[PDB]
Amino acid sequence: MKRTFQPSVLKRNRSHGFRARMATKNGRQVLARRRAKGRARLTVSK
Amino acid sequence: MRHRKSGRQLNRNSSHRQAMFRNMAGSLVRHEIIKTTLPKAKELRRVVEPLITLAKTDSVANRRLAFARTRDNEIVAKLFNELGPRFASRAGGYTRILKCGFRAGDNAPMAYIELVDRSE
Amino acid sequence: AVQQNKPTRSKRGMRRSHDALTAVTSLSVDKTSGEKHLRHHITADGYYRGRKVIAK
Amino acid sequence: METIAKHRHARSSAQKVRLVADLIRGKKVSQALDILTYTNKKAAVLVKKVLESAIANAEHNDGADIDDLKVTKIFVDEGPSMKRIMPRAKGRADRILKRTSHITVVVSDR
RNA sequence: GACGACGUUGAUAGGCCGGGUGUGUAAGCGCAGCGAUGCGUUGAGCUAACCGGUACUAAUGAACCGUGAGGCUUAACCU
RNA sequence: CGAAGGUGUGCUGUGAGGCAUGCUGGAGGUAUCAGAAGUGCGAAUGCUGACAUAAGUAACGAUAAAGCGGGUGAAAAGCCCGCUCGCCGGAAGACCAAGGGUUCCUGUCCAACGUUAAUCGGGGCAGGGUGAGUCGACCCCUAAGGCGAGGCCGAAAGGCGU
RNA sequence: AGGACCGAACCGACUAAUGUCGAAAAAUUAGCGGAUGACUUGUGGCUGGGGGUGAAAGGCCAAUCAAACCGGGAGAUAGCU
RNA sequence: CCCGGCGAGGGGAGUGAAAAAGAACCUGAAACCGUGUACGUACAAGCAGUGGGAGCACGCUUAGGCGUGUGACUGCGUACC
RNA sequence: GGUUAAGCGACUAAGCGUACACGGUGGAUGCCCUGGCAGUCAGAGGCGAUGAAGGACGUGCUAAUCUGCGAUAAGCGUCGG
């Protein structure tokens, strides 16, 4: 079947990327919670 | 229910079955010995013994008859050209089956088929 | 296809009362080579009723 | 004098090695080698490779006598498991556990 | 798995010769036709399991489990 | 010259228990009398770890197809070669973008992985290989569209936008 | 010329089978409807939970939809096991 | 050092207080799984126990008979929450 | 002593049951700590455009990862202990 995750890096980058999530203040809290919860991989990097 | 039938199926379709028994009988006379399982050894006998039967009384027409059933003239070259005086007197059987043993591959009852007259 | 009440290890044993491997103790000795093969079979060195039958 | 040989973690199950190492209970060695050379199985690859290693432990460490040498006890006992995951249909898995077994061969002259 | 037939004091299987059966005028030559093809050879040839024979090959000497005159008591017959 | 714990044993109390002791064990335990509670488990389709059962049953993943000889090797229906047989051929062929990121290749190894064995493998150990003024991007130019200097608008964030 | 005809690709899902502890959390073989249109596909964007979007089935919104999912109120509450 | 596939695994030897401390390593219970010895068992049915009990097998005392194991057969008896 | 009959009658155990001795899997119990929670007591109560918190990629004799550090890279100078 046409399964749901038909992936890319172009869809991925402009949605869940760094400068996307660290654009707005509501995004920024996720970057300031993934920090404080001590996650290694912040959002997506290659 | 098999009652008075013959010719074991060997778990292949008739078209596959006939085409294997060609390329074993082609392989049989070229190297003079083969290792097979027990039933194929027991039923390559019922197939090959026509060939050296129909190759003592040599003719022109029986060359194609062992080419319609063989389609391998190199095997037909060994027939009629050595096998003639090799088998003038043997009115009947030409195979001395040997029960070798057991296939270390998959537990088959392995065996050995040969032409009787062996000196090499 | 299902079990409703598990059988004990008793009846699990008596089902295994008949699985026992048939012994193949009936070896043979050669006529004129003296070695030992399995009956109606050939050796490791190609002997069968005192003949080098396969020469392998 | 008595001697013991063990193959530990033989990659099979207990009933698979129990069946051929039931016949060689209470036997002599040369009839046991001859009943294991021609038993067409995998455990007869297993323990016959080890039962000859037991008589080596006699001729070398204990009693060099092999002719009149018995096998007293032989008992295959269980071992660990390789719990892999097998996929069954419709999304649900299946905890397979690839079985493993231990075998002792005990050789002496009672 | 059992039951049955045999194991060289052998026809139990496979082969083989013959017959039987089934399909129909094999192939290869020669003739008639520019040719497809038709005629002669030729009711030929080929023939699964069928039937009757022939040991040609495969069915070996052994090894093996099974023993070594079968308990007590009474009656009836042996002397 | 042997604590707790474990595992049997003889005794003892109305029971919850206690006391002595054989073996295993190898460094801690605790009387009498009192103080405080994460204080006593069979259940709750309780949670977690482990092990049975069904069972050595079912199944081995398309009904394209094998068969033979040789070799390597401790062992070969499956690995390497040769010989035929069979299957695909607007594909089960060969290139590219996406997407995966050493999966390619030689030496070497079989514990584990490969729904089996395995000398083989897209598996592990080790080393190697990707070479562009023209190929694609990066780069110069915009669409849909997202931000958005001044600004308009809005409790605050922020929304729209040149 | 055709929202024209026949029929592959592409697409869709009608009928039966099989499967339904599936080879698959919706498939495979045999057919079936269309196939220059109101079509089909790729890539890149926009819309948002009482809100999106809908040739309207309460269908679809990451296998879940008569109000998605994560966290937070919150150890809600439970005359009920 | 032997045997093995110059594998795994294992038996000796050596260290060490001990390898029934060996890298899956202190201690190592239970379920589950086998080995051996002893007894019962293939005409008997049924919550599998309890009351009675022959024979056999053993540790012993003291030789009179207890203890432990099994337990033919028999009287009652339909698990727990 | 032998013979026919009649009555009665164990050892057989493919496996299974129970108890002991033996390990087999298993990793609970007792014991252990450089691990963590709750606080007493002072001190601090900030880091940040002479570039942060949190990361990427490099640095050694080195393959890798952790600690430290940053083309001066497990470290430099400097004044002391």
PDB file of C-alpha atoms (C1' of nucleotides) in Angstrom, chain H residues 2 4 7 10 15 20 23-24 26 32 34 36 40-41 43 62 64-65 68-69 74 81:
ATOM      1  C1'   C H   2      45.707 -34.714  24.498  1.00  0.00           C
ATOM      2  C1'   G H   4      38.496 -30.965  17.994  1.00  0.00           C
ATOM      3  C1'   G H   7      36.309 -23.719  15.526  1.00  0.00           C
ATOM      4  C1'   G H  10      36.123 -29.846  27.368  1.00  0.00           C
ATOM      5  C1'   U H  15      48.420 -20.099  40.152  1.00  0.00           C
ATOM      6  C1'   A H  20      30.778 -28.020  42.805  1.00  0.00           C
ATOM      7  C1'   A H  23      35.578 -14.055  32.575  1.00  0.00           C
ATOM      8  C1'   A H  24      27.443 -15.975  31.212  1.00  0.00           C
ATOM      9  C1'   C H  26      30.295 -13.582  45.133  1.00  0.00           C
ATOM     10  C1'   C H  32      10.513 -25.731  34.714  1.00  0.00           C
ATOM     11  C1'   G H  34      16.852 -34.488  33.090  1.00  0.00           C
ATOM     12  C1'   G H  36      20.502 -42.871  39.221  1.00  0.00           C
ATOM     13  C1'   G H  40       3.909 -48.913  43.100  1.00  0.00           C
ATOM     14  C1'   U H  41       2.049 -49.549  37.987  1.00  0.00           C
ATOM     15  C1'   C H  43      -9.332 -55.082  34.350  1.00  0.00           C
ATOM     16  C1'   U H  62      19.347 -54.131  70.471  1.00  0.00           C
ATOM     17  C1'   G H  64      11.119 -56.550  71.401  1.00  0.00           C
ATOM     18  C1'   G H  65      10.090 -53.692  67.913  1.00  0.00           C
ATOM     19  C1'   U H  68      11.801 -43.195  57.335  1.00  0.00           C
ATOM     20  C1'   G H  69      10.345 -44.380  51.923  1.00  0.00           C
ATOM     21  C1'   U H  74     -10.664 -50.143  51.365  1.00  0.00           C
ATOM     22  C1'   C H  81     -11.645 -16.566  45.580  1.00  0.00           C
TER      23        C H  81
END
